[PDB]
Design a protein around this ligand. Sequence first.
Ligand code: BEF
Ligand code: MG
Length: 605
Amino acid sequence: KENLPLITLIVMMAISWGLEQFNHPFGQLAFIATTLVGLYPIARQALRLIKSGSYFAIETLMSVAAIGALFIGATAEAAMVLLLFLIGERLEGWAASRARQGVSALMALKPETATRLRNGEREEVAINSLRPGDVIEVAAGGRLPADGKLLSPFASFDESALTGESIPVERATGDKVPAGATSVDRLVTLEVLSEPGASAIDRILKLIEEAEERRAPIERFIDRFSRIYTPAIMAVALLVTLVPPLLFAASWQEWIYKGLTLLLIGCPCALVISTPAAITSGLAAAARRGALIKGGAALEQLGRVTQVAFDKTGTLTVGKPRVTAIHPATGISESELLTLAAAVEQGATHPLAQAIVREAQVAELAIPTAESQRALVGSGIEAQVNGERVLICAAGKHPADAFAGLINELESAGQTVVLVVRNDDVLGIIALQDTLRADAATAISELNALGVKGVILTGDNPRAAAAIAGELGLEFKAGLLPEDKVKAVTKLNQHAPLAMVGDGINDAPAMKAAAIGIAMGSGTDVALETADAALTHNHLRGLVQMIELARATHANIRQNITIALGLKGIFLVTTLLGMTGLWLAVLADTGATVLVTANALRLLR
Ligand code: BEF
Ligand SMILES: [Mg+2]
């Protein structure tokens, strides 16, 4: 396992070193060879970047530096820096490879396939074999394979992955429901409207790669560094070659040699080793505490952002409801109302019913009875408790005058209220609301400690938006389509680099449109794909720990650099001012490089 192409380079360089201690002048041919063969992929890309307007990219630096000493005597030296580079590179590529498929693990792979109901019989067609007008069946807990027109009486859906809606949607006959997610209770039958590559998920899908066909290429810390440093030394090196003969009358010879020498010594094995070291270290260190950043080029951008755009449903929150308020009619206790509700709601899979039953249990309430359980009527379920017909239904699906005002109150506060009704009397009302992640609050505060302002970008209604945003200290923009998240995000990213965090599909377009997109581990597949980094665990405090780590990495890079090239500086002069000598004499670089290894490890903790 599994690639030996580099392995040859390590061994050619070993064979060279060896047969020079005896049989000297084939040892130098050996190096010429190994230097050249290391140089071929480097010198070649350099030329490619060159042709595409990008010169002074490094591979430029070491192509020129190698080609320099390539014949002035110093082969092993140039061979060595060339060698170290393509190693550290392979290291970093091997970290990004792990990080990517590590994310690829979270992908809970789509199964595809639909169940088309034709001549009274069901067949398992392939999704793409669907035509509009086709009648399709979707079973409870199953996502839609296409945009469908609801054919069945009543049905409720979890289309939070698309719209960011916090609560299931109660749709009726002839209503439109988009592809991808999700019948929550009840087996539904739809009629296909979407044509293959044209479902709601597809329409969102092109916005992603469209926002991609708009992305700025990524200048790395080092391509951007050598963009300055490379022509710097190249310009001086040339001039240290030219000046002495011109004035002085001195052997172009001894200054050709000195010039090219300075050029090469301007590229030690370190520094070239610097940027991969910190990246390999950072990515790994960042992965330790739960955060999988893909490419190290992404990690770089991470230590550069100062803004965050969260979405709420699923990422700031949990996308599961909890009981927030119990309000009984007069002559009843919260506990009776709640237990009577739970009696009907036991069994039911609807997220709301679950939230209710949870409530009864947490409060040490023995739930009873159950007899009928008739999930019909229209957004209401009704069962038979204690001999009576008990109805639990949604908001305005039954008159509740005595409760009207209070209902409004709750509703304006971003709360969703269900009514409990025996005979034809609202025995009382219950208010529920989506729940925010535990570490959310603290996390936000922590981000502020780092000077990172946050906003909420959600497709959910502005009341739920206001509620959650209110618990935190954040601004928000609500009811907004994926395009609007993109628009808002690109509007922000102007000022300062922004990190976008999202769960569902509607965030993915906004994700490729801003510095970095981070997907929740509970994220949708397309979100996990589009994400530049993923949070396993779904811990929001990872974000802080991300940015922190990220910035350290940025610092760490430029430390390695200034030690690497830096001590190449000093011995430079020591060996050239009559010292001449000491330890460091020739050896005092490999003394850098190792510190560049070591300093890069001040990243773990
Ligand atoms: F959860 Be997001 F609002 F799509
Ligand atoms: Mg979401």
